[PDB]
Every structure is written in structure tokens, then in C-alpha cells.
Amino acid sequence: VLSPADKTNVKAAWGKVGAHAGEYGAEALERMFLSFPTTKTYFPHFDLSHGSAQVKGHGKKVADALTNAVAHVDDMPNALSALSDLHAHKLRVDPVNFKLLSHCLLVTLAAHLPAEFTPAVHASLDKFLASVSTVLTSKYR
Amino acid sequence: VLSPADKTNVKAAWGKVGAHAGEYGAEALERMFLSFPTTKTYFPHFDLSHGSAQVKGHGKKVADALTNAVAHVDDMPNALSALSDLHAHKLRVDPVNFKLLSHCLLVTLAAHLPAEFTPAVHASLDKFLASVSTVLTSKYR
Amino acid sequence: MHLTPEEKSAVTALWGKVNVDEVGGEALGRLLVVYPWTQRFFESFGDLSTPDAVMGNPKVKAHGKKVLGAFSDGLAHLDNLKGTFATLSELHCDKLHVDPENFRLLGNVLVCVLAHHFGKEFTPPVQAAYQKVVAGVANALAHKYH
Amino acid sequence: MHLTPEEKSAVTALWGKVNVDEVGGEALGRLLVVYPWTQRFFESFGDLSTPDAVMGNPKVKAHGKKVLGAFSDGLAHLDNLKGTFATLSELHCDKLHVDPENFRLLGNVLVCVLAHHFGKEFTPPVQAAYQKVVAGVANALAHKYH
Ligand code: HEM
Ligand code: HEM
Ligand code: HEM
Numbered sequence A, B: 001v002l003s004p005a006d007k008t009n010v011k012a013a014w015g016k017v018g019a020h021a022g023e024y025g026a027e028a029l030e031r032m033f034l035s036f037p038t039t040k041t042y043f044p045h046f047d048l049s050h051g052s053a054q055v056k057g058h059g060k061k062v063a064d065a066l067t068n069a070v071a072h073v074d075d076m077p078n079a080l081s082a083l084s085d086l087h088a089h090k091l092r093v094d095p096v097n098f099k100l101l102s103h104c105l106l107v108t109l110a111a112h113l114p115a116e117f118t119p120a121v122h123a124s125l126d127k128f129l130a131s132v133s134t135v136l137t138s139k140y141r
Numbered sequence C, D: 001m002h003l004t005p006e007e008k009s010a011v012t013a014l015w016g017k018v019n020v021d022e023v024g025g026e027a028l029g030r031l032l033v034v035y036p037w038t039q040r041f042f043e044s045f046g047d048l049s050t051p052d053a054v055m056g057n058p059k060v061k062a063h064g065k066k067v068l069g070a071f072s073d074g075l076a077h078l079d080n081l082k083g084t085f086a087t088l089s090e091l092h093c094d095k096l097h098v099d100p101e102n103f104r105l106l107g108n109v110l111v112c113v114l115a116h117h118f119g120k121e122f123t124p125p126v127q128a129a130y131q132k133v134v135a136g137v138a139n140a141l142a143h144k145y146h
């Protein structure tokens, strides 16, 4: 579970993301597409070219959801219910892919928040993304 | 989340195991060691030869804990608190390994409970081992 | 593979006793039931609402036979699964958009079906050789993804 | 290992800028901190009780430098990782008893460390090349397990 410490860490680091969340979400997607090409099988309908508006648009959506989970860090299962249902019932993304995006999200933050990306924050952020992932996959079966 | 049908399925299947659980515990370990030799890294102090008393004894231990989990299917977290402790703070087995033992256990049950290893029961047992795995690795960090 | 001659005869001999028809329909059906999200590629098969409905679905059964068929033929090229599955690898990627992780899920389901079927006969050492094959096959099928 | 020439140049270019001493200590320290279960191998290292205790531990720093040292050598034989890492693979298995999953965790941590350090210079495509490299090394290190 996330400890008080983790929560502070996450709110703090995400705090710094601020208005860049959208762009960082998009960048995480691109990194994921390039490093783990098998994730592309879920976006056959997207233009995955560099600077794709679709990717931009999708990056924002993901970033907004993460921002919403930080805002409701004490009630994530409920704050993300809708998204949990969508993923379980319509999208049906294989669970292993969550770990891939999480990883690329951590890389993106690291690349952008050198001062805040401390070991402690890194650990908190990793535990956080794992929790989000668990929520989104909770209704799979 | 185990549904009521799941809990039933699990209790039924395990019910048939009975006096052979220890033997099945031992067989599943043996299958794990052979199929996924990287798992042997956690048992350097054991004699991993076929029919070793260490493997047999350990097989009993694991089966017993499974039994206890089936019995407290409704209160796993609490029924297995000690074991989650042991694994998180002492053993420190990497979480990936739990999926390997779980699989070897299914294979063992399939091989011994043909009539009972129906598609729906298979689904339930899998979810069950997954839940047991989650519990055992919940205090890792 | 990295299949030992001994591990090769073990694979080869169990297989010769296999009814691909039945084993293929069962492996695929179990997959759709255990890991419900895999149903995303088979919407057009119909009613997959229940274990019973999946297991009874003939579209499922016939697809399972086609899949195990191809798998079966691959057991004849154990020394070049890569070249044997190249075209199938491209198809799965480029046309079907199937996440290779699915190949792994099926493999494991396959192993459970064999154990189910052969009981006694499916020994730890025989399981070990099959684990190597299923992994090898998954790897080969995933090889042309880009 | 499927590294395009342009991927190989990119890896090599960046690696030129790395202070292996420093990155080595950071990567190892961070591993022990993000995945505390990995601490199981270092009980003789002393105090690893907090992030500061880990990150500043002279033993972690020295070990990290040793590990990245071996890794850098790996980077000059991208052609033959298996050969390069064979004696190390055997040691990790037979003497150290280190689960190979540990090698993948470190690879991921290392990638975050390089991102942390190079900022914008660690582009999506540079990351993709490094992802291939850490996986190749982890695989080479696990090749002799049995
Ligand atoms: C923590 C990680 C994730 C978050 C926060 C997230 C969040 C979202 C959100 C907010 C949407 C948009 C739904 C809408 O239209 O309102 C979405 C859609 C989608 N996501 Fe997830 N997701 C995550 C992980 C993944 C992963 C790992 C994949 C696959 C690699 C994935 C595949 C998809 C797809 C294919 C869509 C639909 C896109 C479209 O057709 O426009 N998601 N996700
Ligand atoms: C299905 C999940 C598992 C259960 C229920 C389980 C249960 C147990 C039990 C009951 C014990 C003995 C506790 C005692 O001695 O009082 C134990 C010990 C141990 N387990 Fe876990 N285990 C599981 C998964 C694993 C896995 C996957 C591994 C490694 C691959 C593992 C590695 C160990 C080791 C190394 C020991 C100590 C053996 C010894 O020194 O005697 N366990 N486990
Ligand atoms: C052992 C692994 C597998 C093998 C050897 C295999 C082989 C095949 C073959 C031979 C076809 C025939 C289509 C054609 O030639 O045009 C096919 C089609 C297909 N496969 Fe795979 N397959 C495997 C695994 C999977 C898995 C795990 C899934 C999804 C869960 C999958 C999804 C599909 C789909 C959706 C089609 C298209 C069928 C249609 O057109 O209705 N395959 N596969």
C-alpha cells in the first residue's frame, strides 16, 4: 500500500508536472511504442507517427486520469472505477502492458524532473503506478 | 476478487485433493525446479534430487498453507499474515516466481483430478492462486 | 530448440498420441474462459458468455483445430521454428494485431490440457520439454513483430 | 540482440559521456531502494535501512562501480555478449544464487538513471536502443543458469 510518505512524494512530484502532464503523457506513449513495439497491437487505428495528433490527444487523456488518481489518492478504486470497467470490458489490454507504460512514465519523469526524481520519490512513483495498474486490471476476471 | 462460484469451485477441487495434498505439493515443486530452473536459486541449501525429503517436507508445508487458505478463503490476508511477513522480510522471493509455482500446481491438479479439472474449475483455481500470490507479496514494499 | 535429443523424443512421442481435434478445441476454449480478455479477438464467433457456451462453440472448436494444426506441423521443424513461423508471425502482427503475450497464455493452457489428458504419462521431465517447446513456439511467432 | 548500426552508434555515443563510477553507485543504490527485496544479497553491506543509508553506503558504491565496470566491457563486445558474460553467468548461478530477474530489474533502473542524467538527450529512440542492450545483457547473464 501507499504510505503517508509515498503520498507526499507523489503529490509533490506530480505537483511539479503541472501543466506539462499532457506532453509528458504523449512522450511516455511514444517511448513505449519505440521500446516495446508489441504495445502497438492495441492502437491499430492510430497514426503512430512522430507528432501524431492522435498520440498527443491520447497522452492528454492518460495524463488527466493520472492527475485524477493523485487528486483522489485516498479513494483510487472509486476515482478510477469507470476506467477500470472500460479496460476490463472493452479494451481488454493484457495486464503485462501496464508495467511497460508505467516504466516509460518513470523514464519520462526522470528525464524531466532531475531535481525531484530522487531515489525516495522514484520508489514512491513506482509503487503508485503499480497501484493504478492494479486498479485498472482489477475487474478483468 | 473471488466470486461465490469461485470459492465453491476451489473448496470442491481442494476437497478431492485430501490426503494427497502433501504429495501434490511435492510434485508441483519438482515440476517447478525442472521446468523453471531459475527457481532453484532460492533453495541452494536443499537437496533438489528426485524424492529428496527436503523437497517432500517442503511440499507438505506449502500444501498445508494452501489448505488453510481455502479454509479462510474469505479472510486470506488475515489467515496468511505470517506467511506474507516471512516472504516479504526474510525469504524475499521475487514476485515473478509465484506465477511459476501457481502454474505447476495447476498442472499437478490437472494430472491428478481429471474429472474435477473442468474449464470453470480451472478458471477459479487460477484466480485463487493469483489471490494467494497477491497476499504473499503484498508487504514487499 | 535447446531441446535435448532425449527431451525431443519425449515431446515427439506424447504428441503422436494426441487427438489435435479435441486438444485444440479444448486449449482454445480454456484460454477464452481462464483469461477472458483474450475473447477480444473472437467477437464474431458468437456467444462466449459462459464456459459452456465457449466450450460448445464450434467456431471456437474449429479455430482451435486450425491453431493446433499449425503448432503440430511446427513440431517437425523444431530446429527452425523461426523460419517455420515467419509468415504466421507477420500475419499475427500486421493483420491480426494479436499481442504476443497471448501466445504465452495459450502455451501454458496447452500444457494444462496435456496434463489433463495424459495424467500419469505427463511427468515433470516431459512437462519440462513441453515448456521449452511452447516457449520456443511463442518466441518464433513473436519474432516478426515491429 | 537486434541492434541496427544506427542504434549501436547511438548507444556508444552516449556511453562515452557516462561516469561509470557514479552511474554504477546510483543504479545499484536505486535498485536496493525501489525493490528492497533485492537487498537479500547484501546483508554483509551493513545499513540499508533508509534511502540515505543505501545511497551513501561505501560498499554499495564500490559494488555498483564493479557491476557497471563489467557492463561497460559488455558494451565493447555487443557482438558476443554470451561469450563475454559466460564466466560471470556461471558465478551468479552456481556461487551467488542470484535469480536472473534481478538482472532485468537493474536494467530498468539503469535506463531511469540514464534518463535522469541525460535529460532530453535520452530520446525515445535512444531509450529503445538501450532497452535492447539491457535485455541482451540480462539474457547473456542468465544463459548459463541450470
Ligand atoms: C496506468 C495506465 C493507463 C491509464 C491511466 C490509461 C487511461 C486511459 C484513458 C483515460 C483512456 C481513454 C478512454 C476514453 O475515451 O475516455 C484510455 C484508452 C485506451 N487505453 Fe488505457 N490507460 C492505461 C494503460 C493502458 C495500456 C498499458 C494500454 C495498451 C498498451 C492501453 C490501451 C488503451 C487503448 C487502446 C485505449 C483506447 C484509445 C482510443 O481508441 O482512443 N491503456 N486509457
Ligand atoms: C503458492 C505460493 C506459496 C506458498 C503458499 C508458500 C508457502 C510457504 C510455506 C508454508 C513455507 C514454510 C514456512 C515455515 O517454514 O514455517 C515457505 C517457505 C519458503 N518458501 Fe514460500 N510459498 C509459496 C511460494 C514460494 C515461491 C514461488 C518460492 C520460490 C520460488 C518460495 C520460496 C520459499 C523458500 C525458499 C522457503 C524456505 C524453505 C526452507 O528454507 O525450508 N515460496 N513457503
Ligand atoms: C500456438 C500459437 C498459434 C498458432 C500456431 C496460430 C496459428 C494460426 C493460424 C494457422 C491461423 C489461420 C489464419 C490464416 O492462415 O489466414 C490463425 C488465425 C488467427 N489467430 Fe492465431 N495462432 C496461434 C495463437 C493465437 C492466439 C493465442 C490468438 C488469440 C488469442 C490467435 C488469434 C488468431 C485470430 C484472431 C486469427 C484469425 C482467424 C479468423 O480469420 O477468423 N492466434 N492462427
Ligand code: HEM
Residues within 6 Å of the ligand: D038, D041, D042, D066, D067, D068, D070, D071, D088, D091, D092, D096, D098, D102, D103, D106, D137, D141
Ligand atoms: C549488469 C548486471 C551485473 C553485472 C555485469 C554484474 C557483475 C558482477 C561482478 C563483476 C561481480 C564480482 C565478481 C567476483 O566477486 O568474482 C559481481 C558480484 C556480485 N553480484 Fe553481480 N552483476 C550484475 C548484476 C547483479 C545484480 C542485479 C545482483 C543482485 C541483485 C548481483 C549480485 C551480486 C553479488 C551478491 C555479488 C557478490 C558481492 C560480494 O562480493 O559479496 N549482481 N557481479
